[PDB]
Amino acid sequence: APITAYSQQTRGLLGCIITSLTGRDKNQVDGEVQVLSTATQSFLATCVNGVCWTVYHGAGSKTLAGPKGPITQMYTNVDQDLVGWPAPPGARSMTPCTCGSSDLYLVTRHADVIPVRRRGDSRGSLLSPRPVSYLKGSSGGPLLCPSGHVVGIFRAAVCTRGVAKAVDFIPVESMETTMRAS
């Protein structure tokens, strides 16, 4: 595959509990994708045009801990399972893909890059199936075209008996709609 990734951890269990309570994160931010956590779940945010986008079923209505304290959501759409906070400064903002390619790449929280075949506006087949457990925690993760532009973010896995054969995602078009409607 063309696209590669790696991760870097920035916080541990105690620091996360504290930062959650204070809402103030002074760590330098970097990367195209942020790995997020709350008290109960982990998920990802993809930063696209100055906004870091993730799923509602992960973030709910919560603020994001920021350098100036908690950041309020700029966009909240419960029915599309989409939320967005203004992107922290060091976050590397990605570009929306508009040509729409056939072959897509899902970036997981493990920084693995998984080949996906687009099947429609918001659906993509895994070229080889993976355990559900392997994708869990990667909601909000980007689906990219080979060029590295973002076509959508990971929302739900299509699976049977613990095996995922396809993914449902929120298309960048959805992000347009939410921003305009607000």
């Binding site: 696209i3 951890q9 959650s20 195209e32």
Partner: peptide
């Protein structure tokens, strides 16, 4: 009242 917290990042190339 708890905030969502960045615990890591992923760098693309």
């Amino acid at each position: 009242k708890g905030s969502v917290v960045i615990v890591g990042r992923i760098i693309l190339s």
